[PDB]
């Protein structure tokens, strides 16, 4: 994984600590970018989560 | 006394509009007088209100 600011990620456990900006995507051979295997599959997902965590009567 | 009504094919505004002398004020909140702010709204419902699905959604 590629960070935006021209960074690579060596473990995948900063995740955890923040949230994190990534590069676009391009087809270019010197930069080129592709997306993540789980890149907006979580759409719905975070939207439902997100609402779960923001109410708090519970 | 408190009743709200839920009517779709409006039918009861005749059953209670008695002549105005007895003093029975009934609010007729029919479509045109219906104020409703858009954004006192959740997140599926937001979606669905600004959102279709048709084709594969890009």
Redesign the interface.
């Known amino acids: 994984p590629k960070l935006s600011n021209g960074e690579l990620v060596e473990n995948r456990q900063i995740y955890f600590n923040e949230k994190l900006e990534f590069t676009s995507s391009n087809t270019s051979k010197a930069t080129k970018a592709s997306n993540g295997p789980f890149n907006g599959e979580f759409n719905?997902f975070l939207?439902?989560f997100?609402?779960k965590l923001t109410d708090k009567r519970l | 006394s408190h009743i709200i009504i839920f009517d779709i094919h409006s039918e009861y505004k005749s059953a209670f509009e008695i002549d105005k002398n007895e003093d029975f004020n009934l609010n007729y909140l029919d479509v045109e007088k219906l104020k409703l702010p858009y954004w006192l709204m959740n997140s599926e419902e937001l979606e669905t209100l600004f959102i279709e699905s048709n084709e594969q959604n890009s």
């Open positions: 719905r939207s439902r997100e609402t």
